[PDB]
Structures are given as C-alpha cells and as structure tokens.
Design a protein around this ligand. Structure first.
Ligand SMILES: Nc1ncnc2c1ncn2[C@@H]1O[C@H](COP(=O)(O)OP(=O)(O)CP(=O)(O)O)[C@@H](O)[C@H]1O
Ligand SMILES: Nc1ncnc2c1ncn2[C@@H]1O[C@H](COP(=O)(O)OP(=O)(O)CP(=O)(O)O)[C@@H](O)[C@H]1O
Ligand SMILES: [Mg+2]
Ligand SMILES: [Mg+2]
Ligand SMILES: [Mg+2]
Ligand SMILES: [Mg+2]
Lengths: 291, 291
C-alpha cells in the first residue's frame, strides 16, 4: 500500500486488545497506542483498531483502504469519529480511530431503557447526528450505512458517526450507482437505492429517518417482526413504520418527511438541523421537571 | 430380551441396506420398512437401523438396549431423532430410527463451506439444538455425547439430536458418576466429568459449547492440532478454544459461558434458548442482503 507519513503510526507503539461490539466478528479491537498524541510522547492512549477479517479477499482490503481514505479526506467534526492513524507498512493493515467508551448507539440506548434517557436526551442525540450528517453532506460525500450500530458514544455522551465502510465521494457525479455486489443494510435503505441502485444525500436522509426511529424506540429494530426478505414487497406497496411511543407527533412527521417517496421532497440535512435545533431549544427551555 | 408390543416391528417387513456414516463402522444402516407407519400399511419407509457390531460383548448389548429404552422414555420433540420401532424377538437386536437424508451435522456443514451456510443459518442450527437439549434436560436426562457427529439433519434442514448411547436418566440422583470404564469423547467433556467423573445437565452445557464451536467452524475439529492425550494437561491449566472466525463476539462469549470453570455458573439450556432466540430473531429481521 502507498506510504503516507502524515497518518502512519509505529506498530511498536501499538498493542492490540479485546474485541469490540457484541454483534461484531472480532476485526475491531480496543488497543493501547503510545505516542499517538503528538503532544504526549510516552503517554499511552486507548484507541480502537479496525483490521481485515481472517481470510480477507482482494476487495475486502480495497474496501478498508477506501474507508480510511474517506476518513482522511472529510476532515474533523465533533459528531464524526476521528481517524488517529494507520499501520500500513511492513504488516497487516490497521486503521486507528478514537475509542468511544460507551459503545454503539444501540447498545447505549438499550442500557438506559444505567442513567436513563429523557425526551430531551433523545432529541439531543438526534440533533447531534443531524449536525454530523449535515457536515458530511456539505463535503458532498454520502455515508450509505447510517444506523444506530454505526454511531458511537463517547465518555461524555457525544454522538459520533462511524464506520465509513460504504461511504462514497460523489463530488464529481452527484449520485452513486453501484453495479457491483455485496451485502447491504436494506432495512436502512431508501427505495431508489434498493430498487434503482441510486444513492444520494437524499438516500442518506431516508436512512437518517430510520435512525431517528431507532433512537426513539431506544435501540429498537426497524420494521419489527418483518423478515428482511419480506420488506421489498412492503416498500413497493408504500409501507412506512408506525410512530414510536416516545416520539412526539412533530418528530414523527419529520421522520415521515425523511421517508417521502420523492427524494427531492425529503428534507435536507441542513433543514433537519434547523428544525431539530428549534425543537431541542424549546424542549430544553420548557420541559416539565420532577421536584 | 423382554417383549414390548408397542414398539416391536415385524422383521419380515424390514429390509437392510447400505452402511451409514463415513466415520462409522457399519453397524448403522439404511433400510426399508414396510408398514412402519401405522397409517400406510403397504407403504415402504426408508429408515435407519442400529445393531450390535460383529463380535458384540455382554455389555455392548446392554448399552444398545439402554439407548433404545432412553429413546422410548423421553418422548417426541422436533429436534430429537425419533425411535420408530425395534426388532428384539427371535433375532438380532435392531433399533429403528427415522432416516435423516442429509447425514450428521459435521458432514452437512463441511459440504456447505452445496447450498452454502449463512450466519443466520448457523444461528438457526444452534438455536434448534439448544431447544432439543432444553427439552432433554427438562426430562432430567443427560446426553453425555453431544457433538456434531451425533446430530443429524433432515431433508428439510431440521436439526436432530441423536445417538443416545451414553445418555443417562438422572431423575433420582441429579448427577451421574461412572466408576466403570469405556472410551469417552474427552474433547467434548467438561473438566468435572473428565477429572471427577461427574456428569450433570451442566456438563451437557459444556458439551453444547463445543458443539457451537463445531457449528461456527463449519464442521471443524475441537482443539485443533492438539492430540487428545495432550488435552488433559491443557484443561487443568484452564485452556479454552479461540473464537471461530464466523462467530460474533456475543456468541463467542456465550460459548465461553458454556465453558465456565464453575458448573453452576454456566448458563442453563433454558437460558441458552432464550438468548439464542433473541439473537436469531434479530439476525433474521436485520441481516444485510446481497441485491
Ligand atoms: N471506535 C470505536 N469505539 C468503540 N467501539 C467501537 C468502535 N468502532 C467500532 N466499535 C464497535 O464495533 C462495532 C463494529 O464496528 P464497525 O461498525 O466499524 O464494523 P465494520 O465496518 O468493521 C463491519 P460492518 O460494516 O459489517 O459493521 C460497532 O458497532 C461498535 O459496537
Ligand atoms: N438416522 C440416521 N440417519 C442418517 N444417518 C445416520 C442415522 N443414524 C446414524 N447415522 C450416521 O451414522 C453415524 C453413526 O451413528 P451413531 O452416532 O448412532 O453411532 P453409534 O452410536 O452406533 C456408535 P458411536 O457411539 O461410536 O458413534 C452418524 O454420525 C451418521 O453419520
Ligand atoms: Mg458497522
Ligand atoms: Mg465496513
Ligand atoms: Mg455417535
Ligand atoms: Mg452408542
């Protein structure tokens, strides 16, 4: 793999640890990185390392490189997990990212159904992710795998968009159309992406709506009781998920707006941020309190 | 041998066939049984027949009878192979069981490393076997030989626990302790059964963990590269198998739970079923699909 000193990290200063993610297969691990922080030379930092699975194909590697390059290019944002470095020379490919001590969003929410979640907290999570995606979209890049499992939570409860394994740079085409193959998160995909294989910022918006649903159901699984294979027919029929109990009517309509059948009629992340900010501010300044 | 009309089958209506099982020695054969199905009188049914090996001892017979009686007593369950009848009078002892057209679990999995196995399918196999064992344990009986080689697969891919050659009824003692002898499946045995000769539902749980490992390695052999004789020392040292590549971290921890050094701390089949059901449902309703 090509060299890139800027992000290269000394393997010798990296020590792999335990696997991360209940539903993961062990290719993502915790790890100690000594000197990863330019400032602190001898200070060891707990990080997360992603590598190829035991028996990786040719494309597999190609997909991990892309994930890394995507992270390299988009730049820093408070609501996007940070790339810290990579070990690409004389050894297995390791992509080092900051460690989120509270796991993915789904595990995080399920554990607080232990400081329980309040309506305000749910709106806050949603607002933060809309900001992260607004930023990603402003870079003319699509994520393609927006879901609770791909959102991490820091020690201080900050929302971090992660796993850019399917992310694409659409700066020159304005829309990505795959002709290849591979497993895809169909229950999070917009109809046009599923049926026409067309992805855009608007298809990410659709996925954001599903994410909102996961957040308000506190880590629930989309289209409950519906085998993934049965979803295709339902979508062709215009099926849409019901409103989660913890969701206000206003937020449910926002959810349904994200699922508008016409891509261009769905709100933009810019609009979602503005509406979510209004809703967050009002809730923060008006919520009822237990005395 | 005592008579028992209920299960007795006319030899004249039974015609032995080819041997079954690559690793078997020929004492298990395919066979045609005319009238085995009370309903269909002239309809011939393909079944499996187990008999004593050429040069059977006194105990050998005693062990086949017990196997038959165990099957007679436990009752029917979707995930346990069915006893159809037996030829015990005026001739060699024949134990007739339903035929599983896709062989034992190991052969079945190895052949799909030909409709290949998906993660969901592996969880499904595991779930079914946990159900079978949960049922067996509810009858206060232990299997003592739970392994891929002792699991059969039907034409419609249903998992069937089989070979009750070592099974014991522990309704009156709550735990079986052998003082006799005989060859045992040490690589599938819990430390307390190996070292203290004590067997319980919890030792079957340990064996279930090894079975999970076989399933997720697609018919692999436990403790790879380790001669059976070398295992004893490793176990005394607390050795445990590494996670199979196809296994999620969550399922590996379930595996390790089955191998807890403290028998009572291992999960019960009831708990395994509940956790496996949750995992199976989630996977079925959320898996990524290739379009
Ligand atoms: N930086 C990090 N800190 C903490 N946990 C992390 C983490 N990165 C990943 N994880 C955990 O590992 C899980 C899987 O990570 P990731 O989403 O990057 O997988 P992946 O892209 O390798 C494969 P897939 O695309 O199939 O998920 C996450 O859902 C989360 O639980
Ligand atoms: N009902 C059945 N249908 C199809 N194949 C069967 C079968 N019963 C047994 N077999 C095949 O024969 C093999 C051996 O069967 P079984 O496990 O009953 O042996 P066994 O108890 O006689 C001796 P051991 O205890 O040494 O295995 C199985 O692993 C499987 O491949
Ligand atoms: Mg992921
Ligand atoms: Mg990926
Ligand atoms: Mg056997
Ligand atoms: Mg036997």
């Amino acid at each position: 793999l090509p060299e890139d000193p800027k992000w290269e990290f000394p393997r010798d200063k990296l020590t792999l640890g335990k696997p991360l993610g209940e539903g993961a297969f062990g290719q993502v691990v915790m790890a100690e990185a000594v000197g990863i922080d330019k400032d602190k030379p001898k200070e060891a930092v707990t990080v997360a390392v992603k590598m190829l699975k035991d028996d990786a194909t040719e494309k597999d590697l190609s997909d991990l490189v892309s994930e890394m390059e995507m992270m390299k290019m988009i730049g820093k944002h408070k609501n996007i997990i940070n790339l810290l470095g990579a070990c690409t020379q004389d050894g297995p490919l390791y992509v080092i990212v900051e460690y989120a001590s509270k796991g993915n969003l789904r595990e995080y929410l399920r554990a607080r159904r232990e400081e329980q979640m309040t309506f305000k907290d749910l709106v806050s999570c949603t607002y933060q992710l809309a900001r992260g995606m607004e930023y990603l979209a402003s870079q003319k890049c699509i994520h393609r795998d927006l879901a609770a499992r791909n959102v991490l939570v820091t020690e201080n409860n900050v929302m971090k968009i992660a796993d850019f394994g399917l992310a694409r740079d659409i700066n020159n085409i304005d829309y990505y159309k795959k002709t290849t193959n591979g497993r895809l998160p169909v229950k999070w995909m917009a109809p046009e992406a599923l049926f026409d294989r067309v992805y855009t910022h608007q298809s990410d918006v659709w996925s954001f709506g599903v994410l909102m649903w996961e957040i308000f159901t506190l880590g629930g699984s989309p289209y409950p009781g519906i085998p993934v294979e049965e979803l295709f027919k339902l979508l062709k029929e215009g099926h849409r998920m019901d409103k989660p109990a913890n969701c206000t009517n206003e937020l449910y309509m926002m959810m349904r707006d994200c699922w508008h059948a016409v891509p261009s009629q769905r709100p933009t992340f810019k609009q979602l941020v503005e509406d979510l900010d209004r809703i967050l501010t009002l809730t923060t300044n008006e919520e009822y309190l237990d005395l």
